[PDB]
Design a protein around this ligand. Structure first.
Ligand SMILES: [Ca+2]
Ligand SMILES: [Ca+2]
Ligand SMILES: [Mg+2]
Ligand SMILES: [Mg+2]
Ligand SMILES: [Mg+2]
Ligand SMILES: [Mg+2]
Ligand SMILES: [Mg+2]
Ligand SMILES: [Mg+2]
Ligand SMILES: [Mg+2]
Ligand SMILES: [Mg+2]
Ligand SMILES: [Mg+2]
Ligand SMILES: [Mg+2]
Ligand SMILES: [Mg+2]
Ligand SMILES: [Mg+2]
Ligand SMILES: [Mg+2]
Ligand SMILES: [Mg+2]
Ligand SMILES: [Mg+2]
Ligand SMILES: [Mg+2]
Ligand SMILES: [Mg+2]
Ligand SMILES: [Mg+2]
Ligand SMILES: [Mg+2]
Ligand SMILES: [Mg+2]
Ligand SMILES: [Mg+2]
Ligand SMILES: [Mg+2]
Ligand SMILES: [Mg+2]
Ligand SMILES: [Mg+2]
Ligand SMILES: [Mg+2]
Ligand SMILES: [Mg+2]
Ligand SMILES: [Mg+2]
Ligand SMILES: [Mg+2]
Ligand SMILES: [Mg+2]
Ligand SMILES: [Mg+2]
Ligand SMILES: [Mg+2]
Ligand SMILES: [Mg+2]
Ligand SMILES: [Mg+2]
Ligand SMILES: [Mg+2]
Ligand SMILES: [Mg+2]
Ligand SMILES: [Mg+2]
Ligand SMILES: [Mg+2]
Ligand SMILES: [Mg+2]
Ligand SMILES: [Mg+2]
Ligand SMILES: [Mg+2]
Ligand SMILES: [Mg+2]
Ligand SMILES: [Mg+2]
Ligand SMILES: [Mg+2]
Ligand SMILES: [Mg+2]
Ligand SMILES: [Mg+2]
Ligand SMILES: [Mg+2]
Ligand SMILES: [Mg+2]
Ligand SMILES: [Mg+2]
Ligand SMILES: [Mg+2]
Ligand SMILES: [Mg+2]
Ligand SMILES: [Mg+2]
Ligand SMILES: [Mg+2]
Ligand SMILES: [Mg+2]
Ligand SMILES: [Mg+2]
Ligand SMILES: [Mg+2]
Ligand SMILES: [Mg+2]
Ligand SMILES: [Mg+2]
Ligand SMILES: [Mg+2]
Ligand SMILES: [Mg+2]
Ligand SMILES: [Mg+2]
Ligand SMILES: [Mg+2]
Lengths: 110, 117, 57, 129
RNA sequence: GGUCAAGAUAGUAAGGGUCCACGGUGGAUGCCCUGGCGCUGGAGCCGAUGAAGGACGCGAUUACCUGCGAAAAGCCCCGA
RNA sequence: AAAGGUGAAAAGAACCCCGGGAGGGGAGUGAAAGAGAACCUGAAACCGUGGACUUACAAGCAGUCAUGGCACCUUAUGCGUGUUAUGGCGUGCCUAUUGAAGCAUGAGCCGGCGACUUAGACCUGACGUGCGAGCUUAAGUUGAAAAACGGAGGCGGAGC
RNA sequence: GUAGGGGAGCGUUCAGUCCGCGGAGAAGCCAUACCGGAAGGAGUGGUGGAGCCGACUGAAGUGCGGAUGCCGGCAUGAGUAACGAUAAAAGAAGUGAGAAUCUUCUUCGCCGUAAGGACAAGGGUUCCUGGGGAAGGGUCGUCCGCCCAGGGAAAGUCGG
């Protein structure tokens, strides 16, 4: 099945952005972007994570071991914010030097 | 447009199969013998209904002369003598009168015999 | 030549052949010396007794 | 005791299988394994362990290893006491079927059916009575 | 009440049958698309500068496919 | 040649129990494991386990109708439902045939695939619509989320 | 009432329009004693887990029991016939979860112009070592010509 790139293989955000989730259990919760894989539309943000029962043996250890770990989301979270939640986003209109197409919403830069 | 057979054929077959209750063997489980048994069963249902009319006719009669001869006359010289007693005409299932009230069937015996004199 | 069966056998009729395929339970007995499990006129397999020790086990 | 719907019940209650284990895909013919399983059925669970070491059929081995697993789950997981245990149910059903061509006279093949078995046993306390 | 006679009549299932309940096998049916079919319309030659199609290779680890070719999952310039 | 499907997300089952394993039972995750990788649904033929009612002097196209028995009670206490015993009656289905229960054809069973269609300004009728002594366009042109235009030509109108 | 003609209709997919329904659960599947003159249609419950009914009109790859019909699955024969040369095998010892079948020892029997040895065609890692045990081996299997990995193959004079 071809996947992820119905969104023209583009991300609506960057590797280090602060972002908020709207979706399911994690709606309204916030975190820094950590992994952004664009062609599978995956995103990892701090505090979304869960208990991966881990390799029963011999990952240099005899016994296995549960441990909490990051669990990525489809770009079902909603992206950059500044006016303090939600936020659509439009502006790509030249910072200083006039070259970088910075971001904005109904307000200022991101 | 293609229009495959799906769902139609199973529904039909299941209705035939469900007509098969305690049919023996593959009469109850394979569609083809179930349906075929039902063809012959059609024959039997219709014929039998008509015949069941004539069968209870027979049971009727066979009780009536048994009581009649208990009173010393046969069916023939009895259902005659009620009809020859004319207005006496009760006819339908005199069987039951003979089979439960004998005080009454005795009076009907006396009536028939009086009419034949 | 070549006899071959004529109609298929009914589930009823074939299952009533098999009316005689019942396995006989071993008549087991309790070893007077070992704990339990023993077959008659044979050694007790666990302890090896057949009045004292016979076979090694 | 009565739930709002079925999505209801799947959350609130989990189905569990007291006294039951099964060996799937055991590579034996079900009607054979049935001869010996019928010898077990309804006997006190100790006798069943006792009868199966002296029944001289090859199926006794897989059938015993299932019976021990049933005894085990009844004790470890289902916390039954084991001097009450007996085989309430036991029964073998078909599995898949491996097949091979085997050459015969004059050129023709046949297909031969290597049949498997799902052998299952279900122990319970004799505290029925 | 107990024997004796006469008479009648039940229950046993080795295994079977009908029904029900519960499963196994097996992949119909429903839903789905990563795959097809057709019409319409574009576009339409490739090669001695080596074609079409292959063989052998190139990975830390490589059997298959993909890409490439001893400069071998690539090398240089330009634009996004 | 056959070809398919965990879950929204691998969170793809740490740990414990019987087992050499295979397989399973728990604990966890998840809305669901009534989704566990022989991973959507899961019919039918076929194989089993349990239960009700039954069957070891019986002759049987496997039913049908009648009545008694025993169970049962969610379109359901009845003109019920299931199953029985016993009576009466009763020669599979198709095809092919003067004539089929036929000792005549076909067929192990179940599932799915499987056979009166399409075409053409063609003929000839029935029915229906438009316009009617007259009716209509073809190729094409232009517009197309739509259709208009286009008399070349075709049919009536005269017969021998 | 057979071929045959005529009439009115039921159900399936797709399309247009309407009326709507659906995670408090859709189609499909499963049970059923209700309804209609038939094809059929509803009620309720169980299953399922994402789509779908009813009405009117339109178009059809539109209705299967047969064709020694097709594909697939599963049965009967049946725990039956066979298990592939009548050149036998026995004991001890060992390994292992497990041994009539694997290893060792000691005997026995069979080939010996062979059933021993060396090449050519042909085969293509089958060779040796260490592991394995699903399937392949007509039983078993700790073993194998099977599976996994690592090695092994040397020419001025042999053959080209
Ligand atoms: Ca035998
Ligand atoms: Ca025989
Ligand atoms: Mg009749
Ligand atoms: Mg009369
Ligand atoms: Mg002869
Ligand atoms: Mg040959
Ligand atoms: Mg029995
Ligand atoms: Mg199956
Ligand atoms: Mg569907
Ligand atoms: Mg497509
Ligand atoms: Mg090339
Ligand atoms: Mg390389
Ligand atoms: Mg390549
Ligand atoms: Mg070079
Ligand atoms: Mg560049
Ligand atoms: Mg999926
Ligand atoms: Mg397993
Ligand atoms: Mg396991
Ligand atoms: Mg939970
Ligand atoms: Mg399960
Ligand atoms: Mg499921
Ligand atoms: Mg498994
Ligand atoms: Mg789904
Ligand atoms: Mg499934
Ligand atoms: Mg049973
Ligand atoms: Mg039973
Ligand atoms: Mg007798
Ligand atoms: Mg009798
Ligand atoms: Mg007989
Ligand atoms: Mg009868
Ligand atoms: Mg003739
Ligand atoms: Mg005749
Ligand atoms: Mg015959
Ligand atoms: Mg015939
Ligand atoms: Mg002929
Ligand atoms: Mg024949
Ligand atoms: Mg014309
Ligand atoms: Mg022309
Ligand atoms: Mg629902
Ligand atoms: Mg219905
Ligand atoms: Mg869903
Ligand atoms: Mg057709
Ligand atoms: Mg026909
Ligand atoms: Mg057929
Ligand atoms: Mg076939
Ligand atoms: Mg032979
Ligand atoms: Mg030996
Ligand atoms: Mg040892
Ligand atoms: Mg073993
Ligand atoms: Mg030997
Ligand atoms: Mg050997
Ligand atoms: Mg030694
Ligand atoms: Mg030689
Ligand atoms: Mg060679
Ligand atoms: Mg070589
Ligand atoms: Mg070797
Ligand atoms: Mg060696
Ligand atoms: Mg080796
Ligand atoms: Mg093996
Ligand atoms: Mg393997
Ligand atoms: Mg073997
Ligand atoms: Mg030299
Ligand atoms: Mg030379």
């Amino acid at each position: 099945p071809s996947a992820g790139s119905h969104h023209n293989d583009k991300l609506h955000f960057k590797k280090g952005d602060t972002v908020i989730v709207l979706s399911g259990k994690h709606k309204g919760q916030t975190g820094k972007v950590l992994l952004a894989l664009p062609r599978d539309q995956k995103v990892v943000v701090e505090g979304v994570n869960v208990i991966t029962k881990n390799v029963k043996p011999s990952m240099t250890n005899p016994q296995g071991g549960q441990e909490q770990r990051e669990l990525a989301l489809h770009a079902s979270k909603v992206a950059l914010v500044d006016p303090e939640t939600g936020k659509a986003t439009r502006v790509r209109k030249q910072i200083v030097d006039g070259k970088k197409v910075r971001v904005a919403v109904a307000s200022g830069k991101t | 447009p293609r229009a495959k057979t799906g769902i139609v054929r199973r529904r039909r077959h299941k209705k035939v199969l469900k007509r098969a209750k305690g049919f023996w063997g593959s009469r109850s489980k394979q569609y083809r013998n179930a349906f075929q048994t039902l063809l012959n069963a059609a024959t039997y249902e219709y014929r039998d209904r008509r015949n069941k009319k004539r069968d209870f006719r027979r049971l009727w009669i066979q009780r009536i002369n048994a009581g009649a001869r208990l009173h010393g006359m046969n069916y023939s010289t009895f259902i005659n003598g009620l009809k020859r007693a004319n207005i006496d005409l009760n006819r339908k299932v005199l069987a039951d009168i003979a089979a439960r009230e004998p005080e009454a069937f005795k009076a009907l015996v006396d009536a028939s015999r009086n009419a034949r004199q | 030549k070549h006899p071959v069966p004529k109609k298929k056998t009914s589930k009823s009729k074939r299952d009533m052949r098999r009316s005689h395929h019942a396995l006989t339970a071993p008549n087991l007995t309790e070893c007077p010396q070992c704990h339990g499990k023993k077959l008659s006129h044979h050694i007790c397999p666990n302890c090896g007794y057949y009045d004292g020790r016979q076979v090694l086990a | 005791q009565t739930f709002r719907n079925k999505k209801q019940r799947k959350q609130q209650v989990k189905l569990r299988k007291p006294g039951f284990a099964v060996a799937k895909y055991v590579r034996m013919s079900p009607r054979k394994v049935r001869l010996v399983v019928d010898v077990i059925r309804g006997k006190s669970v100790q006798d069943a362990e006792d009868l199966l070491r002296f029944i001289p059929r090859s199926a006794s081995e897989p059938v015993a290893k299932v019976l021990n697993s049933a005894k085990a789950n009844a004790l470890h997981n289902d916390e039954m006491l084991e001097d009450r245990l007996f085989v309430k149910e036991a029964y073998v059903d078909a599995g898949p079927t491996l097949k091979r061509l085997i050459p015969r006279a004059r050129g023709s093949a046949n297909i031969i059916k290597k049949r498997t078995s799902h052998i299952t046993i279900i122990v319970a306390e004799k505290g029925n009575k």
